[PDB]
RNA sequence: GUCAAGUGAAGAAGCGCAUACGGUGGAUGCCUUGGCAGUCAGAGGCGAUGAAAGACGUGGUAGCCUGCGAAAAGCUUCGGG
RNA sequence: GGGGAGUGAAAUAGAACCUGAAACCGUAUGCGUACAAGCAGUGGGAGCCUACUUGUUAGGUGACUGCGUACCUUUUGUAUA
RNA sequence: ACCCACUCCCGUUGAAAAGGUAGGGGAUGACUUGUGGAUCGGAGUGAAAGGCUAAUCAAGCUCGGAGAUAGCUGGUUCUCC
RNA sequence: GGGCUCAAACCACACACCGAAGCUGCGGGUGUCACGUAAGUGACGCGGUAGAGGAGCGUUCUGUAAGCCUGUGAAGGUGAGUUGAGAAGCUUGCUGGAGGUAUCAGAAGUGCGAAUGCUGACAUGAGUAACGACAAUGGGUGUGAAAAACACCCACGCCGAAAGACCAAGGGUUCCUGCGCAACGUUAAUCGACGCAGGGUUAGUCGGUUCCUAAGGCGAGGCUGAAAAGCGUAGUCGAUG
Ligand SMILES: [Mg+2]
Ligand SMILES: [Mg+2]
Ligand SMILES: [Mg+2]
Ligand SMILES: [Mg+2]
Ligand SMILES: [Mg+2]
Ligand SMILES: [Mg+2]
Ligand SMILES: [Mg+2]
Ligand SMILES: [Mg+2]
Ligand SMILES: [Mg+2]
Ligand SMILES: [Mg+2]
Ligand SMILES: [Mg+2]
Ligand SMILES: [Mg+2]
Ligand SMILES: [Mg+2]
Ligand SMILES: [Mg+2]
Ligand SMILES: [Mg+2]
Ligand SMILES: [Mg+2]
Ligand SMILES: [Mg+2]
Ligand SMILES: [Mg+2]
Ligand SMILES: [Mg+2]
Ligand SMILES: [Mg+2]
Ligand SMILES: [Mg+2]
Ligand SMILES: [Mg+2]
Ligand SMILES: [Mg+2]
Ligand SMILES: [Mg+2]
Ligand SMILES: [Mg+2]
Ligand SMILES: [Mg+2]
Ligand SMILES: [Mg+2]
Ligand SMILES: [Mg+2]
Ligand SMILES: [Mg+2]
Ligand SMILES: [Mg+2]
Ligand SMILES: [Mg+2]
Ligand SMILES: [Mg+2]
Ligand SMILES: [Mg+2]
């Protein structure tokens with residue numbers, strides 16, 4: 001099964017009207033002022049104030 | 056699945072090599088044709 | 100449906116699933132802090148936490164039960180010599196699952212699994 | 219001796235596409251689609267020079283009908299009255315009076331009513 | 336002023352890279368950098384490098400402040416494709432297009 | 446002011462047309478390194494004194510082309526310059 | 527891979543390099559577009575926007591509405607499924 | 608084992624231009640197999656199916672006659688009177 | 689179709705009106721005749737496939753042209769305006785950076801949307817199917833810009849008449865080391881049968897060569913055949929022995 005008619009560029013872009021990416025939930029640590037994913041250990045290795053991975 | 060090319064350099068030489076071509080008159084014609092066209096490789 | 104069912108398939112056979120979580124729990128007892136996927140870390144709770152509960156009572160039968168479920172002499176020794184005594188007064192919750200980011204290779208949600216008292 | 223077609227062909231295709239400006243999709247971008255649209259638009263435009271005269275006359279007659287019925291006459295009776303009394307004001311001007319100069323249109327309708335009887 | 340950085344021949348599709356570009360268009364550079372640092376897309380790793388290279392151009396060639404800059408213009412253009420052959424089931428040969436794109440980020444204080 | 450009835454902009458997930466600026470692509474123009482066809486001549490053969498055609502070598506530095514042949518991008522001599 | 531600097535008459539002549547068309551893909555702006563049925567135009571036509579010539583103007587868009595079933599070929603005959 | 612290919616299912620833009628999984632037949636013989644060799648285009652070879660002769664067979668492939676022939680199909684390009 | 693019934697039905701009569709690219713009006717073009725030895729007037733025409741007849745536009749080249757235009761900007765490209773009945777012409781902004789060609793003639797590879805046309809580029813499908821045996825992974829450490837895939841360690845799993853080790857054929861440097869990651873690898877890659885460079889293969893006894901022959905080949909003379917050749921003796925090759 002295949003198209004009988006080439007899909008128009010308007011119709012192609014209309015299907016893509018649901019393709020937009022969403023932004024993640026970003027939080028800021030208070031011990032360091034560092035940006036991290038909400039509910040995730042910070043890239044430096046802190047979660048809710050304390051260092052957990054210690055690099 | 057066995058395919059048509061089963062290489063044997065000895066069989067290749069004895070069927071298509073330079074001395075196989077030079078042995079006959081139609082073989083010499085192949086070498087004349089391939090020299091006239093300018094083939095870099097003459098036989099195999 | 101999976102109404103009220105427990106467990107994660109994790110795209111594995113049950114033999115491989117059993118072998119992997121026994122490997123992971125042994126690794127967690129040795130290192131006290133490991134990184135794995137978040138789905139594996141959440142299912143590792145139900146395997147590794149009953150082993151620490153068992154290790155609180157040191158006996159020949161409990162140690163043999165530990166060895167049947169870990170198949171590791173080092174893990175059995177650590178459970179009854181260190182972890183069983185360390186968590187004697189802790190009523191469960193010996194593990195901590197902390198979400199790290201995502202794996203670079205496949206964007207898999209990562210988690211840190213650490214023993215609660217000291218990792 | 220040898221004649222390249224590139225320059226002349228590009229000029230031809232650009233004239234067509236310039237005429238297809240404002241058309242949807244391939245009708246303004248693709249030559250062999252735009253060529254059909256430019257021809258069809260030309261067929262319509264020729265036919266609608268004829269249709270415009272019909273459309274406007276139907277619009278004048280409808281407005282004259284509305285204006286004359288406000289004055290107690292139907293369109294057909296007003297035209298017959300405008301022939302009995304030799305008034306040659308055409309329907310384009312009559313429809314302009316019926317909208318913009320209502321006192322002038324009333325005077326004409328009264329002149330048609332008197333002529334009928 | 337407006338400063339730009341351009342990455343030509345980014346080995347990713349223009350369609351894929353435009354999803355990330357639509358997220359950072361019109362944003363302050365600091366916010367856009369934090370969005371790109373935590374995105375799961377491959378285009379965000381590439382886009383973040385172009386964005387911070389544009390920020391560096393604005394701070395060296397023009398002497399600006401990162402806190403005054405915002406992403407004024409970002410667009411992704413299609414680049415050169417690479418042509419490849421993939422075998423199919425019955426001797427059929429299929430052409431693979433390996434798409435690349437040009438990523439232009441412009442920062443401006445204004 | 447309250448209520449009722451009537452009327453009603455702006456707020457586009459995306460899309461269209463126009464315009465501007467790009468990208469891709471490599472048309473067009475202009476150009477020529479190479480061809481095509483003649484005209485007038487030349488030469489009308491080369492080879493067991495080893496041909497046509499090659500292989501492998503040959504250079505300060507890897508490869509390929511050109512030349513050359515263990516005397517190997519060349520040796521001797523006679524002229525030109 | 528770029529941004530400056532510099533070279534150059536010219537670098538959007540920067541080595542995939544003269545010119546640099548079209549398809550095709552974008553970004554920006556203007557107008558239109560979420561109660562509406564079909565070859566997508568054409569006739570009429572409001573509003574909005576822009577520019578001066580300041581409304582009998584030019585450009586862009588175009589609500590709403592009349593009419594309207596591509597082209598080629600082949601055929602007695604084709605919107606023709 | 609090896610040779611084979613009876614059934615089903617899968618696969619049918621396949622992992623595969625003939626396969627796979629599960630079953631199946633022969634398995635000291637008119638057996639299977641390696642290396643080398645002989646026979647070929649109105650010719651070969653055929654425990655015979657018009658089978659096979661390099662994924663091509665009621666007469667292989669390749670070049671030439673050759674731009675075969677085609678009362679057939681398709682296509683045939685600027686303007687106006 | 690809505691709806692319609694002393695009709696918005698049917699029968700008869702009458703007066704109106706609507707209605708086409710028909711007719712008339714107004715302006716314009718053109719054909720043929722006639723008058724004009726003129727510009728032009730008059731009359732009648734002017735839908736059209738196959739097809740006949742007539743009149744033109746434009747493109748490339750040659751002559752006109754050792755001319756004329758052109759770096760104070762050619763051709764080409766891209767907009768705007770304007771002229772003609774049309775093919776089209778002309779003027780100009782920008783781009784471009786060295787060529788172009790008036791006029792009138794002469795020659796044609798002279799005009800493209802179709803031919804399941806040919807070549808290249810790029811779309812749609814669609815960021816979809818798929819990522820090639822369902823033997824299987826988990827963790828720690830290192831390195832690195834970056835690690836699910838690289839290296840190491842601890843576990844787990846798979847083959848084991850092979851998924852291990854060889855000889856032959858076939859391939860030909862893929863072998864090892866250092867450096868490296870664009871492309872290649874159906875993902876990433878620091879890794880590689882990938883890129884750059886260097887290194888590496890040592891025989892009286894292994895295998896060839898050499899000796900000997902099988903099938904079969906070639907084959908001095910020879911016999912045969914229009915030619916080309918065919919066959920074959922002496923011989924000489926030819927391993928799989
Ligand atoms: Mg439950
Ligand atoms: Mg899965
Ligand atoms: Mg089992
Ligand atoms: Mg939007
Ligand atoms: Mg200068
Ligand atoms: Mg130049
Ligand atoms: Mg260029
Ligand atoms: Mg609406
Ligand atoms: Mg619709
Ligand atoms: Mg109009
Ligand atoms: Mg209609
Ligand atoms: Mg019929
Ligand atoms: Mg019809
Ligand atoms: Mg059809
Ligand atoms: Mg249909
Ligand atoms: Mg049986
Ligand atoms: Mg039969
Ligand atoms: Mg066959
Ligand atoms: Mg025959
Ligand atoms: Mg003939
Ligand atoms: Mg023919
Ligand atoms: Mg009338
Ligand atoms: Mg009329
Ligand atoms: Mg008429
Ligand atoms: Mg007239
Ligand atoms: Mg007529
Ligand atoms: Mg006619
Ligand atoms: Mg020219
Ligand atoms: Mg064309
Ligand atoms: Mg045609
Ligand atoms: Mg689909
Ligand atoms: Mg799906
Ligand atoms: Mg899938």
Ligand SMILES: [Mg+2]
Nearest residue numbers: 819820821874
């Ligand atoms: Mg695989």
Ligand SMILES: [Mg+2]
Nearest residue numbers: 346834876877
């Ligand atoms: Mg990388």
Ligand SMILES: [Mg+2]
Nearest residue numbers: 850851852853
């Ligand atoms: Mg093996």
Ligand SMILES: [Mg+2]
Nearest residue numbers: 863864880881
């Ligand atoms: Mg190696």
Ligand SMILES: [Mg+2]
Nearest residue numbers: 873875876877
């Ligand atoms: Mg890769």
Ligand SMILES: [Mg+2]
Nearest residue numbers: 880881882883
């Ligand atoms: Mg290598």
Ligand SMILES: [Mg+2]
Nearest residue numbers: 906907919920
């Ligand atoms: Mg013989």
Ligand SMILES: [Mg+2]
Nearest residue numbers: 907908909910
């Ligand atoms: Mg003899």
Ligand SMILES: [Mg+2]
Nearest residue numbers: 900901925926
């Ligand atoms: Mg011998």
Ligand SMILES: [Mg+2]
Nearest residue numbers: 642927928929
């Ligand atoms: Mg032997």
